[PDB]
Amino acid sequence: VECDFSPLLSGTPPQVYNFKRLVFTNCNYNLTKLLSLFSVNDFTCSQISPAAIASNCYSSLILDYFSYPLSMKSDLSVSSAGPISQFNYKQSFSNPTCLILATVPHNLTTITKPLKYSYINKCSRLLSDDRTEVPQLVNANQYSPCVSIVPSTVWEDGDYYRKQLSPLEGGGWLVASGSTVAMTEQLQMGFGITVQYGTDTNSVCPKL
Amino acid sequence: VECDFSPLLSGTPPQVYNFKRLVFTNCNYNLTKLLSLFSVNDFTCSQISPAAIASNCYSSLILDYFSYPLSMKSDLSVSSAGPISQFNYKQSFSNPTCLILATVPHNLTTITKPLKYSYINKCSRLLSDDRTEVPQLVNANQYSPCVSIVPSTVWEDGDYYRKQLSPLEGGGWLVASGSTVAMTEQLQMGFGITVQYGTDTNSVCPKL
Ligand SMILES: *[C@@H]1O[C@H](CO)[C@@H](O)[C@H](O)[C@H]1NC(C)=O
């Protein structure tokens, strides 16, 4: 009962490529209660509406959250080759999904701002001819291949990261670069919601 | 006239974190001559080519040199994943740069070898909540913060270095650790060249 959204509200939210995932089964939610704490700037979904997602019964509810600047809202779409959607964060194309951009108010003191917003601007793989670069696109529900060599906070805008791969990995080099965006007055976050429907398993139902 | 590259030839070159920086203005260089003294093993550039950096006029020419083993060439190509560009040395993002990895030949007698190669493997900041490590990484065209606690040669591999920082710089600790690599028969060095272009001030020109 009463699925718990506190860990979203405690501490510094990770950057987009290090998004923290919360999974909910066999409990009951009030989504609009959580969103009342925030200034909601954007709310868009796919195969579901904002009204429907707050009042439907699921077999599973996944909620990713991270720090995200409102400047880069257009990067959060697969239509455009934005670095975020190619290399940092990508939602399932086969489940109903929603994406929420929100501003943490000042009265909400339990969330703490990082120094800045970081993100991966490139994650590619160098082939054995040492000439071809192949992009390494992030998959749905997975972190980027390049998170192993990119720190949780980009130190300097334009930093470059590389890792020599073993024969078991396929050879070549894994190359990444990170960029940073200046912190805003109030922290701005992203929230990705995914839901699954079952047959009898629909055990995440709204509270009333 | 008379850019002077000879101090690079007299004495013992420092370690990578103590790189000696020579700044040249209003003179005439012949870099090909300098490079003939050595047995160059790698010549890599950014926003400039080796042909171009030898035959162009600049408003400033910065030359850094230090002792560096060739077996750590991989520790260079990783850059912000490895500790050399985190803690020891990082060239400009904003001006064009080249990095040359060279061997001292025996004919060169005025360059004496040091005991071993030393580099900083960790330089972080313990807070006063006595776990908190916050790394203190290097910026472009700057030295590591932890030089002030690290000797010119790391005595033994793994040595730790701590100094408490005063309340007026902030309070807590500054810890660092060092790592060593056995000296080779013939000294191996590394050269970093950075160039700036001026409006009319491009006085540093090649010799004709
Ligand atoms: C959720 O909580 C809000 C107040 O924060 C309330 O207005 C709303 O009716 C609640 N919704 C449900 C489904 O319990």
What letter would DSSP give residue A130? S
Distance A4 CA to ligand 1 centre (A): 15
Within a 10 A sphere around the Cβ of B135, how many other Cβ atoms? 13
**For residue A110, which amino acid is it?**
T
Count how many residues are written for chain B.
208
For an interface test with A, give the residue of B42, B71, B80 to mutate (most A CBs within 10 A): B80
- Which of chain A's residues have a Cβ under 8 Å away from the Cβ of B77? 162, 164, 173
Q: β-strand B28-29 against B205-206: which pairing, if any?
A: parallel
Give the other-Cβ count within 10 Å of A140's Cβ.
Answer: 13
Q: Where are the alpha helices (DSSP H) in B37-76?
A: 50-53
CA distances from A169 to A44, A172, B70 (A): 38, 9, 25
Q: Which of A156, A158, A161 sits opposite B81 (nearest CB)?
A: A161
> A120: which 2 tokens?
């991966």
CA nearest neighbour of A64 among A100, A113, A114: A100
Helix (H) or strand (E) holding A34: helix A31-36
Which residues, other chains included, contact A101 with Cβ-Cβ below 8 Å and sequence gap of 6+? A40, A41, A42, A43, A68, A70, A73, A76, A188, A189, A190, A191
Cα A93 to Cα B61: distance, rounded to the nearest angstrom: 53
Interface residue B142 vs chain A (CB under 8 A)? no
Tokens of B83: 């500790």
- Distance in Å, alpha carbon of B94 to nearest chain A alpha carbon: 10
DSSP state of A29: E
Amino acid at B142: Q
Q: Among residues A97, A121, A116, which one has the least CA distance to residue A187?
A: A116
Three-class secondary structure of residue B33 per DSSP: helix
Nearest residue (CA) to ligand 1, atom 2: A33
> In sequence order, what are the residues at sequence separation of 6 or more whose Cβ sits closer than 8 angstroms to the Cβ of residue B208?
none
Any idea what DSSP says for residue B112? -
A121-A124-A126-A132 Cα dihedral, nearest 10 degrees: -90
Domain boundaries, chain B: 1-115+183-208, 116-182
**What DSSP designation does A202 have?**
-
Q: Which helix (H) or strand (E) holds A6?
A: helix A6-9
Residue B67 near residue B189 (C-beta atoms within 8 A): yes
Q: Report the C-alpha gap between A49 and B19 in whole angstroms.
A: 60
Backbone conformation region of residue A2, classed left if phi is above 0, alpha if psi is from -120 to 50, else beta: left
Residue A33 Cβ contacting ligand 1 at under 6 Å: yes
Query: What is the Cα–Cα distance from A143 to A179, expressed in whole angstroms?
Result: 17
Q: Which atom of ligand 1 is nearest to the CA of A208?
A: 14
With a 6 Å cutoff on the Cβ, whether A50 touches ligand 1 is no
Q: Measure the CA–CA gap between A11 and A17, rounded to whole angstroms.
A: 17
* Cα–Cα distance measured from residue A162 to residue A172, given in angstroms and rounded to the nearest whole number: 10
- Atom 5 of ligand 1, nearest CA residue: A33
In chain B, which residue's Cα lies nearest the Cα of A175?
A: B78
CB A88 within 8 A of CB A120: yes
| Integer Cα distance of A26 and A36 in angstroms | 24
CB A84: neighbour CB atoms within 10 A? 23
Residue of A149, A157, A162 to mutate, interface with B, max B Cβ within 10 Å: A162
Taking the C-alpha atoms of residue A163 and residue B74, their distance in angstroms, rounded to an integer, is 9
What's the gap in Å between A33 CA and the centre of ligand 1?
Answer: 5
Q: How far is CA B33 from CA A11, B38, B42, B202, in A?
A: 58, 10, 17, 21
